């Protein structure tokens, strides 16, 4: 319905687009490029920017606290001084949660739902809203007896593990984790039954943008997955997903306009 952070509120009356700002290889300072990209997504109509410096697509190895901080935390500083936008950090490290909060992050986006050591206490201590992600968890054929029950149970579990650590239930966001331990069938069943997760009375955030769930249906490169990614965005928005995490902000934002105009007539 709304979000609260660092004095600012965000409107979940209508679907909100989050621009992915990855900071791994930028390809002219690397910060400069990040800032230009951020800028371009704001213009386009994102009202949140997700800053990630973790090569979290399967394989490709891992990252250490010190390396993530150096890559992530400057851009957090830079954007915060520069623009008025919800800034989100996708990280699982207590240190990156800590230092990014000081830097002016508005939202903690954790694909590991604070499972990492002290992450939970670091998160709680910032008083900032947290997004939790269903993951099935290392190379394994995903399987569920019943996918939605499993997602419902996972969230139930982690909402409580958060509410006991001191994070108000209304700091919490839920993301069912498209493409995380989910085959193609699973992803579309989850898309299909998305509206069901509205029962926790928390906002939903979803990320389908240029994922293999579009690639494997349309058999195209990531940069040619714009339309399908958008079509996913439209299907989720019609089921009342509050926040859409995307690469292609301009297209998606236009798309949400049609959705909102349709949800108003």
Ligand X SMILES: Nc1nc(O)c2nc(CNc3ccc(C(=O)O)cc3)cnc2n1
Say whether 22 counts as a known binding-site residue: yes
Using CA atoms, how far apart are residues 12 and 241, in angstroms rounded to an integer? 9
The answer to whether the CB of 216 falls within 8 A of the CB of 184 is: yes
Shortest reach from residue 148's CB to ligand X, in Å: 17
One of 18, 169, 188, 241 touching its own copies (CB under 8 A): 188
Tell which phi-psi region holds residue 113, choosing left (phi > 0), alpha (psi between -120 and 50) or beta. Answer: left
227 binds its own copies (CB under 8 A): yes
State the binding partner of 111 from ligand X, its own copies, none, CB within 5 to 8 A by kind: ligand X
Distances (CA, A) of 181 to 48, 153, 228, 242: 26, 16, 21, 23
251 binds its own copies (CB under 8 A): yes
CB nearer to its own copies: pick between 156 and 216: 216
CB nearer to its own copies: pick between 56 and 239: 239
**Of residues 139-168, those binding ligand X (CB under 6 A):** none
146 binds its own copies (CB under 8 A): no
The answer to whether the CB of 213 falls within 8 A of the CB of 187 is: yes
β partners of residue 4: 9
| Interaction mask 175-214, ligand X, x per CB under 6 A | x-xxxx------------------------x-x---xx--
144 binds its own copies (CB under 8 A): no
Using CA atoms, how far apart are residues 207 and 247, in angstroms rounded to an integer? 10
**Of residues 12-41, those binding its own copies (CB under 8 A):** none
Stretch that binds ligand X, among 27-35, 60-68, 120-128, 170-178 (CB under 6 A): 170-178
**Of residues 17-76, those binding ligand X (CB under 6 A):** 56-57
Using CA atoms, how far apart are residues 242 and 170, in angstroms rounded to an integer? 14
Stretch that binds its own copies, among 60-68, 133-141, 160-168, 250-258 (CB under 8 A): 250-258
135 binds its own copies (CB under 8 A): no
Task: Give the alpha-carbon dihedral of 38, 41, 43, 48, to 10 degrees.
Answer: -80
Catalytic residues: 211, 245
Count residues near its own copies (CB under 8 A): 30
Sheet hosting strand 107-110, strand order edge to edge: 172-175, 130-133, 107-110, 86-90, 48-52, 16-22, 243-246, 205-207
> If you ran DSSP here, which 8-state letter would residue 206 be given?
E
- Helix intervals (H) in 164-248: 184-192, 212-218, 226-238
Rg of the chain over Cα atoms, rounded to whole angstroms, equals: 17
β partners of residue 9: 4
User: Binding site residues for Mg(2+), as ranges?
Assistant: 22
User: Binding site residues, as ranges?
Assistant: 22
* Residues near its own copies, by CB under 8 A: 184-186, 188-189, 191-193, 214, 217-218, 227-228, 230-232, 234-235, 238, 251, 254-255, 257-259, 261-265
* Residues near ligand X, by CB under 6 A: 56-57, 90, 109, 111, 131, 133, 175, 177-180, 205, 207, 211-212, 245
């Amino acid at each position: 319905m709304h979000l609260t952070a660092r004095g600012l509120t965000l409107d979940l009356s209508r679907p909100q687009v989050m621009g992915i700002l990855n900071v791994t290889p930028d390809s002219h300072n690397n910060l400069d490029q990040a800032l230009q990209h951020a800028q371009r997504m704001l213009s386009a109509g994102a009202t949140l920017i997700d800053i990630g410096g973790e090569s979290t697509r399967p394989g490709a190895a891992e990252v250490s606290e010190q390396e993530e901080l150096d890559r992530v935390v400057p851009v957090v500083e830079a954007l915060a001084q520069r623009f008025d936008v919800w800034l989100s950090v996708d990280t699982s490290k207590a240190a990156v949660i800590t230092e990014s909060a000081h830097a002016g992050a508005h939202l903690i986006n954790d694909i590991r739902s604070l499972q990492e050591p002290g992450a939970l206490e670091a998160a709680a201590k910032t008083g900032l809203p947290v997004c939790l992600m269903h993951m099935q968890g290392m190379q394994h054929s995903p399987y569920y007896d019943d996918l939605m029950t499993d997602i419902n149970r996972f969230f139930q579990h982690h909402i409580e593990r958060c509410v006991a650590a001191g994070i108000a239930k209304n700091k919490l966001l839920l993301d069912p984790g498209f493409g995380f331990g989910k085959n193609l069938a699973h992803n579309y069943q989850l898309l299909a039954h998305l509206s069901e997760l509205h029962h926790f009375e928390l906002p939903l955030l979803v990320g389908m943008s240029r994922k293999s769930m579009v690639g494997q249906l349309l058999n195209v490169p990531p940069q040619q997955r714009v339309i399908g990614s958008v079509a996913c965005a439209v299907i989720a928005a019609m089921q009342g997903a509050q926040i859409i995490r995307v690469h292609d902000v301009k297209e998606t934002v236009e798309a949400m306009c049609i959705v909102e105009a349709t949800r108003s007539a």
